[PDB]
Motif scaffolding. Structure first.
Motif, PDB file in Angstrom:
ATOM      1  N   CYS A   2      -5.174 -70.286  -3.619  1.00  0.00           N
ATOM      2  CA  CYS A   2      -3.629 -69.811  -2.963  1.00  0.00           C
ATOM      3  C   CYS A   2      -3.201 -69.234  -3.821  1.00  0.00           C
ATOM      4  O   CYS A   2      -2.649 -69.456  -5.238  1.00  0.00           O
ATOM      5  N   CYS A   3      -1.531 -68.475  -3.899  1.00  0.00           N
ATOM      6  CA  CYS A   3      -1.085 -67.856  -4.189  1.00  0.00           C
ATOM      7  C   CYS A   3       0.438 -67.569  -4.327  1.00  0.00           C
ATOM      8  O   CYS A   3       0.971 -66.786  -4.297  1.00  0.00           O
ATOM      9  N   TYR A  11      -1.413 -74.698  -3.257  1.00  0.00           N
ATOM     10  CA  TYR A  11      -1.660 -73.772  -3.967  1.00  0.00           C
ATOM     11  C   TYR A  11      -1.827 -73.536  -5.641  1.00  0.00           C
ATOM     12  O   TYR A  11      -2.702 -75.072  -5.999  1.00  0.00           O
ATOM     13  N   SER A  12      -2.855 -72.658  -6.376  1.00  0.00           N
ATOM     14  CA  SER A  12      -3.221 -73.140  -7.263  1.00  0.00           C
ATOM     15  C   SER A  12      -3.543 -71.365  -7.962  1.00  0.00           C
ATOM     16  O   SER A  12      -5.082 -70.792  -8.083  1.00  0.00           O
TER      17      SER A  12
END
Length: 13
Positions: A2-3, A11-12
């Motif tokens: 995810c962003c 998130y990453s």
């Protein structure tokens, strides 16, 4: 991955 601010939980990027 995810962003986003929405991805704050999974998130990453």
């Amino acid at each position: 991955e995810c962003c986003n601010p929405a991805c704050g939980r999974h998130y990453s990027c």
